[PDB]
Amino acid sequence: QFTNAGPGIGSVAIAAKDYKDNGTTTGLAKLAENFNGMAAGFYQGNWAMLVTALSTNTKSDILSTPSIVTMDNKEASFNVGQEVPVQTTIERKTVGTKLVLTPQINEGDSVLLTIEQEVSSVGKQATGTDGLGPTFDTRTVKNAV
């Protein structure tokens, strides 16, 4: 018996013996809740065999292009996101697509851009944390370029 596998032959066998004579299904239905793959049993005479396999393979692509038109040497703000409370008694934090930019112009062509930006999120509006307040997935970059 191993563990890297979805379920243990223990819970399965016990459940099958507990499901006999119109038994319960809670126990076994709780094992098979998150299982994902191909569990293939085989009986050749007396040796039982259980084969487990799943490959999870994933893909995501994100692309945000928040533009804004500002006067030189005034800081613009630009937000498209949201105010969620955080503990500290609570507090409001604007987490979404933010661009805060104060451009500064070289006489001729080239812009000095002071950027503070991030793409941040409160994970799931219906999901908790191992901590105490909300958490945020952020992608930030504050630099002058």
Partner: peptide, 27 residues
């Protein structure tokens, strides 16, 4: 705004920086 502080040393002549046009007015 940043240059004003720098130049204030050199003066320390009367300076201010306009945040808008980002220009330095010295006398």
């Amino acid at each position: 705004k940043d240059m004003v502080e720098v130049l204030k040393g050199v003066s320390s002549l009367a300076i201010s920086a306009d945040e808008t046009t980002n220009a330095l007015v010295i006398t």
